[PDB]
């Protein structure tokens, strides 16, 4: 109900985002599928405690925020590249 799986499973990187997101890498953030992560939270094998779901919620939102961070960085860099190619 509280510590499910010892992790390295499906919600593994979510759990890591929720606690020590320092150790969460750009490869992790990119390959994280937010919708199957949410799906295994809203209906898990065993019902999980409000504490665990609270962490995981922040896990999912933190990865989602990092996807935006990279997409923004990349869009600014793609827009600069086009302006530069004009000249």
């Amino acid at each position: 109900a509280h510590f499910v799986l010892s992790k390295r499973g499906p919600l593994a990187k979510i759990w890591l985002a929720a606690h020590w997101d320092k150790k969460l890498t750009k490869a992790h953030v990119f390959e994280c599928n937010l919708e199957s992560s949410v799906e295994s939270i809203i209906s898990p094998k065993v019902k999980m405690a409000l504490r665990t779901s609270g962490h995981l919620l922040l896990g999912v939102v933190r990865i989602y925020h990092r996807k935006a961070k990279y997409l923004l960085a990349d869009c600014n860099e793609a827009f600069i590249k086009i302006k530069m190619a004009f000249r």
Partner: protein
Amino acid sequence: MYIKQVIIQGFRSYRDQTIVDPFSSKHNVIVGRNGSGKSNFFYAIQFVLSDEFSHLRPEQRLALLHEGTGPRVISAFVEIIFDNSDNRLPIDKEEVSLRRVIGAKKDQYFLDKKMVTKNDVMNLLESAGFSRSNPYYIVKQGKINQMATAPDSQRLKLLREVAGTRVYDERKEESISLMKETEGKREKINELLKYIEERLHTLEEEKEELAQYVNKKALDQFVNFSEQKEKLIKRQEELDRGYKSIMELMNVLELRKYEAIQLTFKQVSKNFSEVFQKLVPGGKATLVMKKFTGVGIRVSFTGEMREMQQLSGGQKSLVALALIFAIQKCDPAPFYLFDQIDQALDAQHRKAVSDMIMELAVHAQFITTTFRPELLESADKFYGVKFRNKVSHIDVITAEMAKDFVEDDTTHG
């Protein structure tokens, strides 16, 4: 994950470098004369792992240095070496070391010899299952009494927080703040895609104007830019899917808020009855929800149950302990530290608590102290504290030395 070894230096009575012999993964019991430094041994571990020692004023930091005799000490450290076989610590090592060093104006954690912050150590232990919401990874008499003599409202506040009400409301609020900050990045992202699309329209029609007949590089890479833009779009769409998934999640979590909490309460109560009946065979205990407003205990060591208020001494202590055991079994942990939790119990009830640790130690590590020989029966490895020259030492002893020492020691009650 268990505590494999402890090293102490300069901490309270442990002036000298004390390399404690590596613990058994099961039950380790520490015995020694009253005031020889056994509680100091648990403080040294709590100094590294417990969040109540995380913030130390400089005066509090200094009071942990050894002030025993001669060259008054200017630095201390304690080092926990974890076994990390079951890879519960998010660190790809079989052994993880965590040292905290203090000095006059130094207070530094080290993870495998590399400096880390206090938040790092908190998050490191949180992701291994050690919840700041659970006050019972260390149990002392102070906690047992605090439980036994607590208002029913306090029992409720504690169980609510363990169930996760405070954690959840805090993560919910930080999530929201993140969503709205992200909500700005998504707009700026859509702006830039509109600006890029603009230049792709400019480009295409300069490109067309030349075919009837701006650097050639932009014209050369026109198809490259258009291909790149769709790769950005697909990622932008991934964000929009994710936003929808989060909204569902937040909504579903909020709608299951109470049945989550109610399921944690039903579990603790079910455990409280089971734990107690096993410690007091032919007894009945259960939690009661009041006016919600509070949580009370009703127990019968016999079919007519009395309350915690009108209960004996070493019975209030046993019942409170039984409740703590239930919460533990409900939010379990890889290792436990018991500082004389058998202190206020009858010989019979110490024997039952000893029988329970025997079975628990099959699945978690225990590091305990006692001055009564019941708990020595459930132990797997034995340590004795010796105190001479106001300096604590700790050494492995045999079971017979432990049982003999405890039997004819006069220093305790």
